[PDB]
A paper describes a structure:
Mal, which is also identified as the TIR domain-containing adaptor protein (TIRAP), is essential for the TLR4 and TLR2 signaling pathways. Mal acts as a bridge adaptor to recruit the MyD88 molecule to the activated TLR4 dimer on the plasma membrane. The C-terminus (residues 80–221) of Mal, referred to as Mal-TIR, is the TIR domain and is required for interactions with TLR4, TLR2 and MyD88. The overall structure of Mal-TIR consists of a central five-stranded parallel sheet (βA-βE) surrounded by four helices (αA, αC-αE) on both sides.
Author numbering:
A (entry chain A), B (entry chain A): 79 to 109, 128 to 221
The structure:
């Protein structure tokens, strides 16, 4: 629960083809919010899932999403799914019962995502 | 870890339109393996996910799948996804990195599923 229990505040889980957008989000989150692109050995307080068409195809990404929710948002963890470049129809059905940020929101969804991260951080010692 | 820590050995998580098949599996599992159709207040050792086209659409089903894996198969729990009436292409990408039973297997996938349940049960006190 300690704000320093993790070395990063938020990391972005993005597919290979979405590299640029991921970085744009990291910059946005920086500007304090410490952020990076999620690595395997990566461990932060919040994990933003850059869910794009590419992310949904890559079987490893999906598995990552699944494990990112394995132990996550149930009030215990912080996982923020950002939906970009996808008709709301293509959206993963399970999202109708979970928190997520629509890319059509203000600042391509970035603002609401930062706010989401920001909120969780405060609940920390 | 006690075989009696749960009242049922296995319950089947099936969509509304797959009611019949679900029951067929329950009968198969019975014939000792205690089994039922998963309810909300349902709690068993193993949970078989009857993943069919219908199950994948129903947003509640997907959420159920997600939560059925939230705390599950990582060596700790027992969740068995059975894929029926779906071209392997439609299969949830995350499955390429997880255990599952193909409906094209012997006994419409039922045999391998019973074996899966059976195996987990023995690892119990």
């Amino acid at each position: 629960s300690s704000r320093w229990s993790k070395d990063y505040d938020v990391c972005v889980c993005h597919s290979e083809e979405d590299l640029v957008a991921a970085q744009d989000l990291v910059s946005y989150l920086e500007g304090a919010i410490v952020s990076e692109l999620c690595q395997a050995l990566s461990s932060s307080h919040c994990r933003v899932l850059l869910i794009t068409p590419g992310f949904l195809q890559d079987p490893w990404c999906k598995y990552q999403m699944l494990q990112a929710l394995t132990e996550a948002p149930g009030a215990e963890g912080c996982t923020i799914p950002l939906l970009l470049g996808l008709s709301r129809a293509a959206y993963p059905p399970e999202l109708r019962f979970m928190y997520y940020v629509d890319g059509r929101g203000p600042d391509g969804g970035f603002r609401q995502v930062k706010e989401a991260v920001m909120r969780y951080l405060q609940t920390l010692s």
